[PDB]
Symmetry: D2
Subunit: 261 residues, 4 copies
Amino acid sequence: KPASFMTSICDERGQELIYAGMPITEVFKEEMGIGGVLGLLWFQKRLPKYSCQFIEMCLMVTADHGPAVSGAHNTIICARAGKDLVSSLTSGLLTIGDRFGGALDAAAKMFSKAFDSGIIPMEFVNKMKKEGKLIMGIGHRVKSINNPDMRVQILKDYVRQHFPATPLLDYALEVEKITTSKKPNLILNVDGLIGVAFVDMLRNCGSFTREEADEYIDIGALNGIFVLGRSMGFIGHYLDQKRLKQGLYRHPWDDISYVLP
Amino acid sequence: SHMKPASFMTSICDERGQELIYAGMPITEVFKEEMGIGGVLGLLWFQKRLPKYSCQFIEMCLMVTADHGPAVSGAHNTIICARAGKDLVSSLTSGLLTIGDRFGGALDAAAKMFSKAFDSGIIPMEFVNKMKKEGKLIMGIGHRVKSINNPDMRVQILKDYVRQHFPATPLLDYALEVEKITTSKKPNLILNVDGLIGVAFVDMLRNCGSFTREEADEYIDIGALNGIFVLGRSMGFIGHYLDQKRLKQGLYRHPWDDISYVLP
Amino acid sequence: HMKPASFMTSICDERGQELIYAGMPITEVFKEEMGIGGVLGLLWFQKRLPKYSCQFIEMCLMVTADHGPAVSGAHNTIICARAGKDLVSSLTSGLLTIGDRFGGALDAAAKMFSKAFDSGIIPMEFVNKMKKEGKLIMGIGHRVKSINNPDMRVQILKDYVRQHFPATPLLDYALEVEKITTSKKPNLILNVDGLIGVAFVDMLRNCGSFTREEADEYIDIGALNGIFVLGRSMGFIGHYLDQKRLKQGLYRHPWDDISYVLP
Amino acid sequence: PASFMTSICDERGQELIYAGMPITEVFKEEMGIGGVLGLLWFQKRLPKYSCQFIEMCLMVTADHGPAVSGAHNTIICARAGKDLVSSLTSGLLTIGDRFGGALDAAAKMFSKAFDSGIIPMEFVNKMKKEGKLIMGIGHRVKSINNPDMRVQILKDYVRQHFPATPLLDYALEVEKITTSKKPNLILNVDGLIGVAFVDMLRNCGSFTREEADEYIDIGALNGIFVLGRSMGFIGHYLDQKRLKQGLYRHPWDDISYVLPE
Ligand SMILES: CC(C)(COP(=O)(O)OP(=O)(O)OC[C@H]1O[C@@H](n2cnc3c(N)ncnc32)[C@H](O)[C@@H]1OP(=O)(O)O)[C@@H](O)C(=O)NCCC(=O)NCCSC(=O)C[C@@](O)(CC(=O)O)C(=O)O
Ligand SMILES: CC(C)(COP(=O)(O)OP(=O)(O)OC[C@H]1O[C@@H](n2cnc3c(N)ncnc32)[C@H](O)[C@@H]1OP(=O)(O)O)[C@@H](O)C(=O)NCCC(=O)NCCSC(=O)C[C@@](O)(CC(=O)O)C(=O)O
Ligand SMILES: CC(C)(COP(=O)(O)OP(=O)(O)OC[C@H]1O[C@@H](n2cnc3c(N)ncnc32)[C@H](O)[C@@H]1OP(=O)(O)O)[C@@H](O)C(=O)NCCC(=O)NCCSC(=O)C[C@@](O)(CC(=O)O)C(=O)O
């Protein structure tokens, strides 16, 4: 009778629930917060307090960015179609991972690879252009070296105050000085910031070996950060459409080009 | 060492043996007997070998519900998800999850509501007035763009087939009388495709001979009818996904000028 | 001409210099140390809530974060991850199990207990009447926790509410119901759905940011189920990552656990 | 400029149109479900035998029992009291890689070998040398003298009705080599459907090679499996409701908990 399931993160078979070896009462006695629970359940580690707080700040900063982005819009459409909360949320979450919400992960990987390989920022920039590859985590539809992004400033201020070192973030900022020298909209965007700061946390907070940090980036920890954070906003938009008593939506024919054979 | 009772029960398909079985029909007999997709649905959903005209009706329903353009909630969401770079299954399901009481999934409720009124003995006008006195939408009635001035050819095709092939259509007849009343008052309160398929399946299940009344009522109650639209329209949503990938449409973001922001 | 807008929105404005959550700029959200609980108060309830309320919301997300791999949603997420799928697919395969039976009884519990309380029915008459009809008490019952196997999640929440909330009439009523139901069936405890449900009603009704009608509306539109959905999303993502790190392979349910009864 | 563009269906007129054919003409021409799929997925009026082939694939893939990942997940949702769409979707979301992905995988692998100009014996050897299993080959029980009847049925139709089947021919030569090594290593139903579908696209007359390859690459065969198996998943949903099955919780005896200390 060899067990068909295997699990590492939570044991609810005893009288008191356990998260990664910490009884739930100790989680609260130690004031771990949501960020510390995430460290237990996603990484099976008791993270330092500043790392737990940084995780919570990432969830707060990614909670929403308005009703116009793909996933919020799809949730809103479901809500207006009279659907339940979970269906509507899911409809929006399913838009995430590539062009919407995927740049956190892509930036963490692309910057880590350049940094680890020893290529300097100017040569990384020149390489990616000669190769016609966009630098993930760089560029924004509206923000600029003159209209800075406040979410970037907030997270940047915090990690510099608490992290032992932020080498990948510093490298990414050297890239930004070069890219914005040319095009002022090629800033380090909020997705690139979270991505590189999260690598710096995993690599420098002391709870991970390099191999462990590399594995958690590879299996999608950062995808999870964006998904969990933005779920709060999408549920908010679901509730908002119901509070505003919004009826069924159908897209107007004027905004659609039909090109049949 | 002791025998553990099985935790799951299943009735529709057996893959354990020398050949696949659908509701007791071996797959070789399914094809020998020319059961087609409609007959396989009869086996897997209704546990019966249905008459040929019923199998053909099921296929007609899947064909007429296959798509209704990119503007409807589910197609719009599938398109947005494809344009966000997502895979076929994620994009399809993002659209399917819009299907419900307002878009696409009123077949269950329409069958139940019309059956109740019909079986209760109230006449069509009394049904319309009662729903109005309560605060209740007539499910299977109404459309955002189709109307008495813009008729739905899907409904016509289905009606035509049912009248030629079904042995009895009392609920469809009742529903058309209702539609006569609702469209006099408001021109887009037509019998929509959900309502037509809903009442036509009630007529089929009650009168085709393969079901007892108890069985027919149970299939309405557990939600079989909505599956017809879900399975049908899945072909269109997959089409939209493929279309958007071929067209290489980029990431969508809704325009701010179409949104009224009213924060506290 | 002025074409009217087709969408309305009230919770977040990203158009300006600085992101705004429900009228609070993101800089002030962090200066005021609102935390995740305060952001939820802003985005879901459109209010700046007191700190003890924000901390209670965070506690609810922490205590609902996971309850093992055996429950319906974690099971489905694990199986989807073992099928090689991506994080979002695997998470949502499990979230879609949340409803009346597993995880999503908070809406119904809050509505049913609020209705009983507001009507003046005493706990025993509430129990007998649901018993005399065929209606489950939402927020009562558990497959494995019981009077002999208590839920520490419930204990932690009750302790916090008792220390910080200004009033707890619905919780007190629900605990009276639990005494009655567990007298005859040891598994009919007040579960985490019912506890969070009734505690949230007590919070919304008495925190001072809502009229009774406004609080009742949030129950009616289904806000409280979101608390479990968002909370448990953290555990389901954890299960996905766990299965990927464990290199667990494709799952297929054993035939010996399935009774086939075809026509 | 219009924000949406679409090619497959026009519902703006009085009469609905599928890819240039009015719906009344779809029925007058007895296009069937296969012909509708040709219009909506490919914007082509496919030959009759191609349309019938498509319907046979949907029938053959409709279900394969309650134990596979997606059917199981749908069953769990149904036992949790959820609605049809939620329960169906929970199961569909398991599809694409280790479950339900072999039609696509086999189409691609065989097409790549064939287009390499490499002969079957060299393909088998290249794959052994690269450590790769051959997609669409192998079955747990059936054998060169105990055949899979789904393969027999579809193979017979294809060989009787397709004018040319070069990729199937190629795959049958691979199978003769692999069944010499192990009588178990048959072309399975996913391999058959995969290569036959490629043959249909490449040889039915309606597509250029570029178009055929594009439809494979963007997931047309994933679509065939999803649409086909959706019929069975809906069946399982209804079955669980009919059988009045209550909430499931997996037994602790079948679970190995390995938390940190
Ligand atoms: C973001 C954008 C599409 C913008 O493009 P743009 O449209 O302005 O410019 P393009 O027309 O593509 O090109 C202009 C010229 O600059 C060159 N150029 C552009 N980007 C370049 C680059 N990265 N590396 C090198 N060169 C570049 C290009 O090659 C051309 O050069 P050339 O013609 O040769 O002169 C683009 O940067 C991009 O893909 N970034 C990488 C992916 C990424 O990080 N995504 C996340 C962005 S944060 C986000 O998504 C969150 C959100 O925004 C969500 C919301 O609210 O919606 C929020 O706030 O939450
Ligand atoms: C479908 C729609 C939202 C349309 O409404 P409309 O928006 O135009 O009207 P509203 O502005 O909402 O209401 C104006 C006044 O009429 C009243 N009124 C409306 N419907 C009424 C009714 N049924 N019974 C009584 N009264 C009614 C209402 O109470 C209000 O009265 P009041 O406030 O008191 O002054 C609405 O009928 C509805 O929910 N139907 C029931 C659900 C149903 O059967 N859905 C399936 C149809 S689609 C489908 O399945 C697929 C599709 O065909 C879709 C596509 O192609 O688009 C495809 O193939 O994709
Ligand atoms: C939860 C369960 C299905 C368990 O039932 P059981 O299966 O053990 O009992 P059954 O065999 O169904 O019934 C035996 C006899 O008791 C009667 N009886 C049962 N419940 C009764 C009741 N509420 N009111 C009156 N009577 C009742 C029934 O009428 C029958 O009477 P009779 O046949 O006439 O002799 C059931 O209570 C139930 O639906 N509750 C309401 C929904 C609810 O609140 N769900 C949330 C709880 S989980 C959650 O949200 C998260 C979770 O904690 C999950 C985890 O950890 O697992 C986590 O964190 O993951």
